[PDB]
Every structure is written in C-alpha cells, then in structure tokens.
Ligand binder design. Structure first.
Ligand code: HEM
Ligand code: HEM
Ligand SMILES: CNCc1cc(C#N)cc(OCc2ccc3ccc(N)nc3c2)c1
Ligand SMILES: CNCc1cc(C#N)cc(OCc2ccc3ccc(N)nc3c2)c1
Ligand SMILES: C[C@H](O)[C@H](O)[C@H]1CNc2nc(N)[nH]c(=O)c2N1
Ligand SMILES: C[C@H](O)[C@H](O)[C@H]1CNc2nc(N)[nH]c(=O)c2N1
Ligand SMILES: [Gd]
Ligand SMILES: [Gd]
Ligand SMILES: [Zn+2]
Lengths: 404, 402
C-alpha cells in the first residue's frame, strides 16, 4: 500500500484504494510514463464480471450489500446478459455510474463537486435530430443564465451488430480554425480538422477569430448530420481587464460552458460513446492554456507589447507578468458577466479538501499530479507539495478513437 | 515497442530507445504510477563495473579494443584480489559527468560536459576535507562568474567508515526554533542547526546566518568547521522598482552546492562528493522564499504591493511571486553573480533533449521536476512528454549519518 506524504504539512496517508485498480497503466518498474497524454492504445464471461463488480459497488454505496434487492439484482443482470448478450442499467445505477466516473477521474481537480451532478437520460434517443434537441436541453440547463450547473447526458449504450452514437466535435462549444494560404490559422488551431470536417459536410464558414462551430452529430450507421447552435444558447463572456482599459479592444472572447463531448463513458462493462458532460471553467484553462499556448491563440506577446514590457529578454519575466493579467482579465470578466468561474487557488484548495474526504471514505484518491497542478503558480498551490498516486478505477471516462 | 514520446506544441515524435537499458527499477507499476513521490556481491559489483568500463571505452571510441579488454581483466582481477577496485583518474572524470548527465530531475544538464572534477580520493581527515571543500567553493564561485565542479572524496570501502558531509549543502542558513513553534531563519535547516550547536557551535539570532560545516572522517564523530566569511559570497535582494523590498533584509547565497548525495560509479560508492552549479532563479524566489514551510514571505510582499489579499481571485499570490522572482534575477545580475531564469533554462534543456536523442537515443527526465514551480505551461518543457528512469553512473539519495 503506497505511502503518501504532504510536504507542506508533514502529514502521511496510505492509499489502500490503489489496490482495487482495474486496468493496467502505462508505467513499469523500469520507466515512468506518467507524463504521456494518451498512452498505448485508445465475451459474456467478461461483461458479466464487470457488471457484477459495479452492482456490488452500487449496493455497497447505498448500505445494501447482501440484501434481497442485491441478490435479486445480481440474478437479473445475469439473466439479461444470458438472453441478450448485454444488460440494461436501472436509472438509479446510471446516475451512480456517472457520478463514480467523475469521482474516479485522475486528471480532474474539480472533483469536490463529484456528488453534485445532473444526469440526463437519453438512452431512448435514436435519431440524430433530437440527439441535437437533447444537447440543446443540456446546454440550456447547464448554462442556466450563467449560474453554471454540472450535468451529463447519456446516449444509448453501444450494441455489437450496429453502430455507435458519436458527437464529432470534441466540445459542444468550440471556435473555428481556418487553414490559411500561409499555412497559418485564424481562430483556434486546436479546432482545425473539425472546422475542415464541418465545411465538407456542408457548413458555410465564417470570417472571424471566434466563430462557434456547428455540431456534427452521428446516429448509428448513418453519416453525421450538421446542426447549428442557436446563438442565444451559446453564452459568451467578452474579455476585459479591471484596470488595463486597452485590453477589451483586443476583442478577445470565451464561452461560458466547457462541455467535453468526445469521451467514452464506461459503467459496469457497458460502454457509452456519446455522453457529453459539463461543469464550469477554471480560469487557468482559458487564461493560460487556451489563450497563451503557442499552438493555441498565442496572444501572450501581444498583451506584453500592450503592457510595454521588455520582450527583448526572457528575464524581464514579461511572459509571466502578461500571463497573470490575462488570467486576471478572465476572472474579472466572468465575474462581471455573472458567470460561474473558479480561480486556480480556490480550485486546488478544495481538491485538497476532496483528498481528505476521499481518504476517510475509500482510503485514497486516484490523482494525476501533472494534471492537478495548475499551469501557472504551481508551487504556490497546495497540491504541488502533495504526493499523489495515479491508477485506474471503474466506472470511468476513457478516450476513444475519432469516428472518422 | 520502446516508449513513444511526443512534443505537443510542435508535433515532434521520438522513441526513447535508451530507456530499455535502465539498470534499476523505480516506484511505478502497471497498477499504479508513483512518479510524483519525492523519495521513492562480487558478481554483482563486477557486472556494474563491467558495464561502466564498457561505457567509458565507447565514449573514447575505443570499444572492443585491447586497452578495453585488459581493463576488464584487471577490474575482475582486482575485485577477486581485494573485493573492490579503483577508478583511473580519467574514468573518474567520465563517471562524474555521466552522473550529472543521467540525473532525471536536473534541468541544467545542457552544461553536463563542462564539469570540473576535483579528485580528493587521497583525503585523510576532516581537516583536509575542509581544505578541499574551501577550494571547491573558491573555484566554483569565482568572484561571481560561477563554474560547475564536483569534489570527489574517498569511496566507501570495507573495514573503514565513510567520509560524510552532514550538511545538505556547503552553504545553508540556520533556522532557530522559537517556542511559538516559530522559526528564525530557514526552517528547512532546523535539524542541522541544533546538531551544529550540540557539537559546540555558538549560534546567531539572524535570519541568514551561514551554518558551519559538520564533516565526518571514517570512524570519527563529525567535526565542526567555520567557513571563512570572505568565501561565502552572498547577494542582497532588492527589486528594480520596488524600493521598499530592500528593507526586507533579504539575501541569498551565490553557490548552490549539494553535499549529502551519493555518487555511484561502476558499482563503487562515493558517499561524500559535493557538487555545484549555479542557481535557477525560481529555486530562490518561488521555492526558498515563498514555500509556506520555507521563508514564506509571499503575503508580506503582497501586502506591501498593496495587493488585495482577502480574496484569491485577485491573484495576489501570483503577482507577488512574479515580483519576488524579478527581484532575485535583478539582484544577482546587479551583483554580477551567475543566474539563469526559467525560460532560458527550459529552453536550453529542450536542446539537451535534442542532443541526447541523437546521441544515446533518449534521455531520462522527471517532468514534475523539469517544469518550473511557476509559469509551467509558459515554458517549452511543459508540452514535452518525458520518460523517467534510472541510469548509472548516478547521484542517489542516502540516509542522514545521524
Ligand atoms: C464543476 C466544475 C469542474 C471543474 C472546475 C473541473 C476542472 C477540470 C480541469 C481544470 C481539468 C483539466 C482539463 C485540461 O487541462 O484539459 C479537468 C479534467 C477532467 N474532468 Fe473536470 N472539472 C469540473 C467538472 C467536471 C465534470 C462535471 C465532469 C464529468 C462529469 C468532469 C470530468 C473530468 C474528466 C474525466 C477529466 C479528465 C480529462 C482528460 O483526461 O483529459 N469534470 N477538470
Ligand atoms: C550549472 C547549472 C545548474 C542548474 C541551472 C541546475 C538546475 C537544477 C534544478 C533547478 C534542479 C531541481 C532543484 C530542486 O527543485 O530541488 C536540479 C536538480 C538536480 N541537479 Fe542540477 N543544475 C545545475 C548544475 C548541476 C550539476 C553541476 C550537477 C552535478 C554534477 C547537478 C545535479 C543535479 C541532481 C542530481 C538534481 C536532482 C536533485 C534531486 O533529485 O533532489 N546539477 N538542477
Ligand atoms: C488531453 N487534453 C485535451 C482534452 C481531450 C479530451 C478528450 N477527448 C478531453 C479533455 O478534457 C478536458 C476537460 C474535461 C472536463 C472538464 C470539466 C470542467 C472544466 N472546467 N474543464 C474540463 C476540461 C481534454
Ligand atoms: C528531493 N528532495 C529535495 C532535494 C534533496 C536533495 C538531497 N539529498 C538535494 C536537492 O538538491 C536539488 C539540487 C541539486 C543540484 C542543483 C544544482 C544547481 C542548482 N541551481 N540547483 C540544484 C538543486 C533537493
Ligand atoms: C506532456 C505533458 O504531460 C502535457 O503537456 C500535459 C501536462 N499536464 C497537463 N495538465 C492539464 N491539466 N492539462 C494538460 O493539457 C496537460 N498537458
Ligand atoms: C510531491 C512533489 O513530487 C514534490 O513537491 C516535488 C514536485 N516537483 C518538484 N519539482 C522541482 N523542480 N523541485 C521540487 O522540489 C519539486 N517538488
Ligand atoms: Gd501606449
Ligand atoms: Gd517605485
Ligand atoms: Zn509512473
């Protein structure tokens, strides 16, 4: 059982939860690959085994292991797989399953909220048209006029012997990236292939730097159909700085609802390829990674010129001065627009609170150090001086190949 | 199936073939990663010696020669005879450099080829130890123009105790325990400070009192030595445009000289082998000055900067931090003492990775240590996937002699 020390406080805990780790990770005794983003890849005998452990995990959660309901529910799932080769989750289980996947997510610093999650059940969906309507309800509910509310939306489980539900966009809201004559990119360079795929499937492109893409939605064994998001459903925050008046004139924007839509959800050996979830942004996500990554909006230098910083030399720490005010601008703008946002300090301190909670409840917490530590001011946050143990528990969110 | 490694800012992809030759195991398994943890015979000694001798004779492009083969014979012959063997002067120099080269948590390794190796394997007492250490400090410091060096003392050997330096660095500041639980000076050195006093040292009452050295010769208690004040070069910390900052009375020392690690070469162990380079400014400004368990000046500074300290969203911590780092860099440049910022550091380390991929087919690197403790994703090492593993020769941690 791994020993884990917090070097800021001196405290020691033992991670007994690691012992119950399902799938094997990329690391081996002879090399650590903990920093890789995607490592490696991407029978009723087995499906039943994953179903059973999940069921047990459910009744355990609700004080009812060994009960009448438990025994009955175990026999029910078995009979179903025997007859059909798959089984169906009771709604309550689905809810639990979604919450556990969020809880078990090693890279998510926001898991203090893991218990508070709205779950929309779209397993009865089977057209691409109102797969889109299902998405619109989500975006509407979760945006909630800017008082953001965590939610997930579960579409039908994959069936062998006819195709998957997929959402071709990686987020429900993303900005267009237009390949240029230079080879350069106007807009967001992260979203270039999806901008490409949008045009080829019919979308008439825009002109600017912040054009919200159209959703590419695919129902089983059909080709993806393009829909447009009603502009009044896509809430955006114009970026302004509380003291640097020129900042607004840069015309930067970002959207309110971070909603990841290209990850597969797995519960008890059932696999859900289309299941968009959303919470709310940590300002460092927008202000540092999105706006300041050299391969993203890459604005850093522009902001520095505006601040009249010494960009002649790295040791002015101009990159650092400018990054901070960009982050300041994000938090200020979002607060002014009454949109829920959390700063990297508030966020990391609650995650500490979460580690302590998780200790008492499950004897540890799977946590990926590199993803929990913010991309600015790392050691100024408490999670930096905290030893972490990364491992895989199920239910989970897993990456998947892109449908094309 | 060697590991596939990607740079995510550029799109470069390489395969770390070097990693397959990892000599030892780390803390990780397929079940769980433990990569963020801080602290994770003759046949056996021979096979390491054999591998190191092969390393050396390849670097001097003489692999498979008969100088190469005969060296193996006499190593195996000297292990048979006396249960051990001695490094040639030349091999010692190769081995110390490689150790730096193989150290996964060092961002400064572009410089690995330029390392001054001082051979003190004939040292005989703590007094001589002191003399050797002073000359290191004078050579490495160089009136501000810092130079990389390592002084290698006698290897571990049977029938005789170790040479040990009890301090974790040649230059550290005392931390005096007050009975508020409060600490005057650097709190990370509370332990070394009372050890010193227990071995007959008259303490101070300042926040920056340079500690004496506690040096251990075989089968001998440690012996106290005071560093001549004119040898410990320090830098008063002021800020280019925050004039009140100077009034904090803050300083830091020129020369970062780690002295408690074990240098292992070809199976031989050197428990006392102090090495040094020059500072990366984040070590000083972010970790040593801002860690809550270190000097912890962050809020004092923010309050003087008139920052709003009652809410986290004002990002007071981040601003005050950046300014402490500006003040460090500015003071060191002002005082003409070598120092590197974290953008230049990580930049040159990117080059090192490139050199190393061409040279040995990869490089061990501890991501969580290579990324600066401020402004991570602002630097190029953040977006670079890395493979962490253990090669020999190496610097290893080792227990405190007390
Ligand atoms: C409610 C507020 C939330 C905050 C502030 C938050 C914060 C974050 C952040 C900053 C990341 C790192 C993302 C990146 O750097 O690319 C992350 C990752 C992640 N989040 Fe959360 N999150 C929240 C809610 C949620 C919800 C509602 C879910 C799903 C139910 C979720 C599941 C995940 C998963 C699975 C990852 C890992 C993604 C990956 O491996 O790339 N989080 N979260
Ligand atoms: C010349 C300029 C150098 C720079 C700028 C530099 C930079 C750094 C930094 C910032 C660290 C991490 C420190 C920490 O956070 O604890 C480090 C670690 C390390 N360095 Fe370097 N270094 C330099 C020279 C050297 C030399 C000359 C050697 C040995 C000959 C060396 C060996 C090591 C080792 C073994 C570690 C890991 C320490 C640990 O794991 O606790 N470095 N270096
Ligand atoms: C690997 N980096 C790119 C990336 C790819 C994928 C996929 N597939 C998901 C990703 O998820 C990021 C994420 C996930 C959930 C979040 C919930 C809330 C929030 N504020 N940010 C959140 C950010 C990121
Ligand atoms: C793992 N715990 C922290 C730690 C432990 C030890 C030991 N023993 C040494 C340490 O020193 C780090 C180090 C080593 C060499 C350096 C060379 C130059 C420089 N600027 N910093 C440098 C910093 C740190
Ligand atoms: C190579 C490196 O692992 C990669 O850039 C990671 C580092 N840590 C991260 N952490 C978060 N939260 N998000 C990221 O995209 C990344 N990228
Ligand atoms: C727990 C964690 O590994 C520990 O605090 C590490 C994190 N990364 C680090 N990185 C560097 N360069 N130096 C450090 O001291 C640390 N501390
Ligand atoms: Gd101006
Ligand atoms: Gd001033
Ligand atoms: Zn690992």
């Amino acid at each position: 059982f791994p020993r884990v020390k917090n070097w800021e406080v001196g405290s020691i805990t033992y991670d007994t939860l690691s012992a119950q780790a399902q799938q094997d990770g990329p690391c081996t005794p002879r090399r650590c690959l903990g920093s890789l983003v995607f490592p490696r890849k991407l029978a009723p005998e087995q499906l039943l085994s994953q179903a059973r452990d999940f069921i047990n995990q459910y009744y355990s959660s609700i004080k009812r292991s060994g009960s009448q309901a438990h025994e009955q529910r175990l026999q029910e799932v078995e009979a179903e797989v025997a007859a059909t080769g798959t089984y169906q989750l009771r709604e309550s289980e689905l809810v639990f399953g979604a919450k556990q996947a969020w809880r078990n997510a090693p890279r998510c610093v926001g898991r203090i909220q893991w218990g508070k999650l709205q779950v929309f059940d779209a397993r009865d969906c089977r057209s691409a048209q109102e797969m889109f309507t299902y998405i619109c309800n989500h975006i509407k509910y979760a945006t909630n006029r800017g008082n953001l509310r965590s939610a997930i939306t579960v579409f039908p489980q994959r069936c062998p012997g006819r195709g998957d539900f997929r959402i071709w966009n990686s987020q429900l809201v993303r900005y267009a990236g237009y390949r240029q004559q230079d080879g350069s990119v106007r807009g967001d360079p992260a979203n270039v292939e999806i901008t490409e795929l949008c045009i080829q499937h019919g979308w008439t492109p825009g002109n600017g730097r912040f054009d919200v893409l159209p959703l590419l939605l695919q129902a089983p064994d059909e080709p993806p159909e393009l829909f447009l998001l009603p502009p009044e459903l896509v809430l955006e925050v114009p970026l302004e700085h509380p003291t640097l008046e020129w900042f607004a004139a840069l015309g930067l924007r970002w959207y309110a609802l971070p909603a990841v839509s290209n990850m597969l959800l797995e519960i008890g050996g059932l696999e859900f390829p289309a299941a968009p979830f959303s919470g709310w942004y940590m300002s460092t996500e927008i202000g540092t990674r999105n706006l300041c990554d050299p391969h993203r909006y890459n604005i850093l230098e522009d902001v520095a010129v505006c601040m009249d910083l010494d960009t002649r030399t790295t040791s002015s720490l101009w990159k650092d001065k400018a990054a901070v005010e960009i982050n300041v601008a994000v938090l200020h703008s979002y607060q002014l627009a009454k949109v829920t946002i959390v700063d990297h300090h508030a966020a990391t301190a609650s995650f500490m609170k979460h580690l302590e909670n998780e200790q008492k409840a499950r004897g540890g917490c799977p946590a990926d150090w590199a993803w929990i530590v913010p991309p600015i001011s790392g050691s100024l946050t408490p999670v930096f001086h905290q030893e972490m143990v990364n491992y895989f528990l199920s239910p989970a969110f897993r990456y998947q190949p892109d449908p094309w």
